[PDB]
């Protein structure tokens, strides 16, 4: 019985800019329960149909999990284009695997702020599929030095999410995983 | 070739209200002599990164020009609200090119102060993108034909005194 429980029932999920990748092998897993589970809001994937997953013996399984806002969730799919997709997590067009997302707004919000899950904005020079690069530094066009923030001149690339308001269908703190075969 | 030196090295600059326009085309202009110069305090470009304009060809560009304060430069932007973004030359919310400015206190100085400069400060309503109004008349609720009679134009009281020094603004829009 392969242990997907801790992957799907962990405590502290990694930030989007530094998503944690887990290795799964030498185990037998059942996909009947995952598709039969209605507690997960979104379960749609291709490359292999979900109903036929009970008869496969592929080599390696990757468990990637991170946290994204309820908006731009569809940007996780490959061949897309967006603020987060093209910049912090890009999937190749030759991708095979599935994407799973569920709401977890029961233990993140309705408090004096969350301030846990950072991200970088529309900057840098785009992304390639599967890099996981963290080079936090201050840079901006305009023939500038590197001394500090100085907005009239430079910016600090990363800022925070906000899920304090109870409002927002696409603003609730959703959690997402992407299994790759 | 397009002679940018005519507008960037002219002798006199029109006031903000009656700003002299220009339209240049059918020539070759390089966007490096002005970009690399260190005399420009501010050089902000919208919709295009400055060093790739040479690889782009357009139908026609424009060269607006006027004179404003130093601390009043920032109203020249897509959609603020002040004394120039509502009552004088006002940018639209659409595409805009590269807005330039620099300090020009060298040739605008001395005890008298260049009172020839003037600006509009008594407009009765908002403007349209690139309005360029030309008129002069009082406004008041007195129903008096030919006059209480405050002039609708004031004079920039310039003098060699950090947000009041003369600046030169030239806008490239295409």
């Amino acid at each position: 019985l392969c242990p997907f429980g801790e992957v799907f029932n962990a405590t502290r999920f990694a930030s989007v800019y530094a998503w944690n990748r887990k290795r799964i092998s030498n185990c037998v897993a059942d996909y009947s329960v995952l598709y039969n589970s209605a507690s997960f809001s979104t379960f749609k994937c291709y490359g292999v149909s979900p109903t036929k997953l009970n008869d496969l013996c592929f080599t390696n399984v990757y468990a990637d999990s991170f946290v994204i806002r309820g908006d731009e969730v569809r940007q996780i799919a490959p061949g897309q284009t967006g603020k987060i997709a093209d910049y912090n997590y890009k999937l190749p067009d030759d991708f095979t695997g599935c994407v799973i997302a569920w709401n977890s707004n029961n233990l993140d919000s309705k408090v004096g702020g969350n301030y846990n899950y950072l991200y970088r904005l529309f900057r840098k020079s785009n992304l390639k599929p599967f890099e996981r690069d963290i080079s936090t530094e201050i840079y901006q066009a305009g023939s500038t030095p590197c001394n500090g923030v100085e907005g009239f001149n430079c910016y600090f690339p990363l800022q925070s999410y906000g899920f304090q308001p109870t409002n927002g269908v696409g603003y609730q703190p959703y959690r997402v995983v992407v299994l790759s075969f | 070739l397009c002679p940018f030196g005519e507008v960037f090295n002219a002798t006199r600059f029109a006031s903000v209200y009656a700003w002299n326009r220009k339209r240049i085309s059918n020539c070759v202009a390089d966007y490096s002599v002005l970009y690399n110069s260190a005399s420009f305090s501010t050089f902000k470009c919208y919709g295009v990164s400055p060093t790739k304009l040479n690889d782009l060809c357009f139908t026609n560009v424009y060269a607006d020009s006027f004179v404003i304060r130093g601390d009043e430069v920032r109203q020249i932007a897509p959609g603020q609200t002040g004394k120039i973004a509502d009552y004088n030359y006002k940018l639209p919310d659409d595409f805009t090119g590269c807005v330039i400015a620099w300090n020009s206190n060298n040739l605008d100085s001395k005890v008298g102060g260049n009172y020839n400069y003037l600006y509009r400060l008594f407009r009765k309503s908002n403007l349209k993108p690139f309005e360029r109004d030309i008129s002069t008349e009082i406004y008041q609720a007195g129903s008096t034909p030919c006059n209480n009679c405050y002039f609708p134009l004031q004079s920039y009281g310039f003098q060699p005194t950090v947000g009041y020094q003369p600046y030169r603004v030239v806008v490239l829009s295409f």
Partner: antibody
Amino acid sequence: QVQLQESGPGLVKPSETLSLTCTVSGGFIGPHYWSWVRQPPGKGLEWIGYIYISGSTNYNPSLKSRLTISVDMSKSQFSLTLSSATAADTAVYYCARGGGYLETGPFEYWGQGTLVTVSS
Amino acid sequence: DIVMTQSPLSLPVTPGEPASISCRSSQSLLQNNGYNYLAWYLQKPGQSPQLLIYLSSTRASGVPDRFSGSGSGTDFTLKISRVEAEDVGVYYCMQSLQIPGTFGQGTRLEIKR
């Protein structure tokens, strides 16, 4: 230097027009937006709206149905008229000089303050 | 509307050491310019509010040069290098990107003795 000052009645009956006047002294006519602001007792501050010298103005959407503001160049005074008020509007009113006109909002100068009460 | 938040709500500080007050926004505060608009007022007991910082990085006329701010986007921070006997009051932070402009709850600074 500019020294603002208010004046007006202190007690007003419910559902009755409220009138005040923030006289300006010293620095006369100029290209500066003027605003109004109030404060519920023991709470935060609430900005209302701003008026230009000519007369153009923008209003807070919450109070855009029963409030008016004008100006008078000759007397260097501008007034605030609020009608059909309730008891919730009992507060202290300050008149500013810079105006938070969605551009910079430099509140360079503030008034002394006047308290108004709604009761019968 | 966009709502301002501060942290903490009360702060006791002994004279001599630096302090800090944080005001976090709910929406990105950066107009089409490179500027980010913000303000920091100071209301002493029994008086009217005064201006200390505007544009989050430029002081006002006559203000002692001990106050300063930094940050961009949705995070800003004000610091007082050396507090004094006259720094008793309630501090507010204003956003002015678009109508309406609303303040925060108001940090209360406490002096120790």
